[PDB]
Point group: D5
Chain length 155, copies 10
């Protein structure tokens, strides 16, 4: 599997992908049909944050009219990071940034209390988002972060 | 309810609290017994990120030997933010920072797709962390971020 | 409704829009005639900070000679943020930045005093700017920031 | 009237003031009674962003048990700025920071359209906040930014 | 009068202007002939920091062979700021930056002593530079900053 | 003459000086009587940006009740810089910062036109501020920057 | 095991430890005797980057004359990060920082080629340093970074 | 031997090289066959961080279809630095960044203990990565940093 | 003599110069033959940091096949600074950056001790570099920084 | 030989040294009498940038009335760097900073031309400053930076 150490070719691809998605008026859920992969993972890959396996890459390429150069690029491991400069201004992204700003030390404390010294991994890791009703009317998003605990032991 | 626009008084209190917790070899779970509140909310308050209502404030104060000045301060709305400078270096906190760097654009894309224009709130919001076994051996943390959808609509 | 996680497409559109606006010597008030929406909301949309509903997108498109790709793009939720880098140097924008720098702690203190723990929303939110004569000669701008109170409550 | 070019003494005073306010459980509204000044201005001065005239100073000092050294310092013109580092993390302050991030270019555009070249002043300027009921239930804050237009003219 | 909230189109015009000036080997003094306006103001406009009134724009355009699109853009209010990133590295500009770094606190102090609370305006403001002989041989520059005093008054 | 490469001892002295000035309700003008030096230079020195010659140092020390350690320290060359972090938030200081942000390129351009390649010195340099009436009512500050031209020549 | 979300108490212990070590003229090798742990791990713990298990803590405390408050603190999980601000100026540290700046893209590329998508872990991880003779005379340091490969797999 | 003080032309070459590598689905190991150089050095050079000697340059160029301008450019000493901004967000690169953030002070301390005052060179220096099995299953990367000790001595 | 307040046209010229130097395999020493100017000055000008007198411009242009527009631009005063962002990552440049980081305070201390208050000029200034043998084997660079002392005196 | 990974103890020692030097009105040259070491090295050590051999430490200690704990600390290897935050504001230090900003790329270009790939060392390195008459009146400083060339060789 190929990889890239800089983001501009993948950003170009992502732009090609989004213009096609917008022009065709598609959703990510529809684009993900028949990929054999979860919506969060594929969306992230279309947005330039993951490689797709070859067959998944071809499925989405069929729906967005991507050529073979794009299909190859879609298979490459990218230089990751979806917030240029690290600090988001977009309110939608910023709210998630803010959750970590506020609860970061709480997360550290409760990880060390319930698991021990070490980390919750962001690589052995799955993310999903679910829409649920709010009892007081309206709707809520429940975002689940599921990471493996990796301990820090004396060596 | 009182509030502060600067962080040093709560930081001083948080340090008082942590030294006591360490001296008495207590856990956050133990300190939270009887508050009638969630562990994540009360831990966050002890770490300077929330005000406690007075009953919960007195409950934690007894466990930690906190005086009436400390109890008053625990009831004040703080200046929130748990990562000085915004960018963490501690690996445990960084992993959660990293999840947002990588999946931020995905989180935005799918919120907009499944909800609409707007945000998932970081204020009308609940967080909890659960430990579950990994089938392959070891442990996993499942962190739930649960926020109200707030639409952006024209005016 | 489509969305974008990067700003370059809307930036290009915004530049197309401003060049047309300047060539035709139009005002934002005249471009907004017929949209059934507030001047500030539609101006911000033209400047790449909001999506327009299709009716309003077509109305402004006619005045500016915008094609169908441009009309589709005007309807996409953008990656928001109108000050590159966060810190403005333009004096006009900087004065509003300075108002928050100076009165930020005061706004916090009084929000918590008069409403309680929580925030004044920037999403459930309206802005408008009004021109009124100054008695001493000259003119004043009255800018109204109108946001919903959202409480922070224990969980 | 005296002035200071560094903030720490005034920071110390502000801390003294807030600890007495919390200890006595006072509101800013109560503290401001009989000062002859607006709540926003006096709150800002207590929080270290403005001098108070001598008599207003003595009035608040009586209520907060401040001595003559504090009364003298309350009258000094401070080094202004209430967000250390300029970028707030506290959600309540951040929301107002965000309004300028999002609507900054719109504010510039409509100022130039409706007034002309120049600025809306942050000095010949008044701020206030009102609490108004929301028709759909709940409460809203209406913050008014009232600034003199200062034109830029060719010299 | 039109305005822009982003600098790139104006930056492009400024480059066109500077390439014309270098090609024809003009001085700003010679370009300014017949504008009826001050050299510092018109120079700043050419370098992208001010609009020109139409007559002055046509005068300088004739000398630099600018077309109607340029003349029109030269009349637009720009996004101001002449130092990308705020901190200059060019020694000539840096010296002026350094004067403010060193004397900033003195300026504040003497403003409040001699005028009172408030600012010296950077908008109701004129700048000029004069060359005068140094008695010991060589030359001095006398740069004059002439701004309106705007008081801060309790409200 | 002695020098310091770090600022904390002068900052402490400057604080002592200011607390005495505020306590005695002195002006800088009164403090400067009989120093044989200009107000801007001595004010800068009091604010920790310059050394004073021994006798000027003693003249100001008599007025502010400084001992012989302060008098010795007043004669030391400091680590200069009066804006911590370089970017001011205080509106009074910021306006002078903003003059350089806006007119920086103009100053460079006119310096090279009228003098040639090189710089206007910030060292072989004098500053002064004057208060003059505004014919349209009110008052203006005229700040004079008087620097020696230092050419850049091929070597 | 206890943990701290802020560095100040551990920084104080580290200072105590370093002053003892310097005063007694001890080496990290001599302090590590009888811990049963690697020199690099225990050194990092003494410098505030890891907790020690109790036995090791008591062993090193005996050699440094640390009391029980310190032995308890030495067992707590710290807020990790040994370079304030992230960017080192000290030449010895900077060279290691430099290796990553230069070879960072190479490490990425070869990790993805030889292992696949994912990371080399900084947690399931051992470091050691060895001194070896340079044949040309002089000495070399062979620093070994030994981390678990954690794959990124599509989900 | 030629050199460049800016990175863009080398970044363009690097993009050309990567696009050919991805197109032909080559590995760095395959590309490196017959260069007479180690994998880490040649990979670094291909990625813009090192010059290649002429014959090695021609060997890789034959495999990637690079012309003579590319071959000349491959032989130039570049402006080194592989992480724009210095701080990586890509998890693979960040992990190596993190090892230095956490073990920085430890590396310094043990260099001075085992070698003395001075540095471990990043120039008289060799890097290599090795894949080894993990006893508990899976795989480990062993990265070797091999640098010359350069002493600091009184002069 | 003409000047530029932005670097892009000069950066383009520098690139044209370097692509020709690499294509023709020239040295700076060779390009400089017959300018009657020091190697350090002309190299800096070729790299965009100085104007050349017309004669030198035409001499170097002949060797690099530069047209008249290039010759004209080589004579313009540039916006100076050779390290984008101020902090170099390239190791060759960084070592010189590091010398100032380490010896900055010593340089200040000894300048004031041996000369007095004021500066060593970076404008009335010459730089040169000499290759000399190291007695212990190898070579040393002796870089000479030759600047005029400009006093700071009380005014 | 002891070392430290943080600067505060050495900063305190340096303050003690400077306060003694000022009180006794000593020069660095006088403090350095009898060390056997160059003025530049010993001045840097006193300012916290190098360790002294015990003999030199005790010599300078006798002149400054330093106790035994200070003598011990003076022999420790420090965490080096003499400009907090890396970017100087003090004009005297900034001029040296500026020389590297302007001539950085030229130094790189000529190092590679005259030596080859690699660096000029900042560690195998000597610094000195000489006062020289200016032929046209006044004084000059000649700062000599003398470093070992370290080659970068393909491996």
């Amino acid at each position: 599997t190929q990889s890239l150490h800089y983001s501009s070719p993948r950003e170009t691809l992502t732009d090609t992908i989004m213009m096609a998605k917008i022009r065709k008026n598609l959703t990510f859920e529809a684009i993900n049909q028949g990929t054999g992969l979860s919506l969060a993972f594929v969306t992230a890959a279309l947005l330039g944050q993951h490689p797709l396996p070859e067959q998944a890459a071809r499925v989405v390429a069929e729906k967005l009219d991507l050529d073979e150069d794009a299909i190859r690029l879609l298979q490459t491991i990218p230089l990751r990071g979806s917030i240029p400069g690290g600090v988001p201004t977009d309110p939608t992204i910023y709210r998630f940034y803010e959750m970590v700003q506020i609860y970061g030390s709480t997360l550290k404390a409760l990880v060390h209390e319930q698991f021990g010294d070490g980390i919750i991994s962001a690589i052995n890791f799955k993310l999903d988002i679910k829409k649920v009703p709010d009892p007081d009317g309206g709707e809520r998003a429940v975002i689940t972060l599921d990471g493996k605990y990796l301990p820090t032991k004396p060596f």
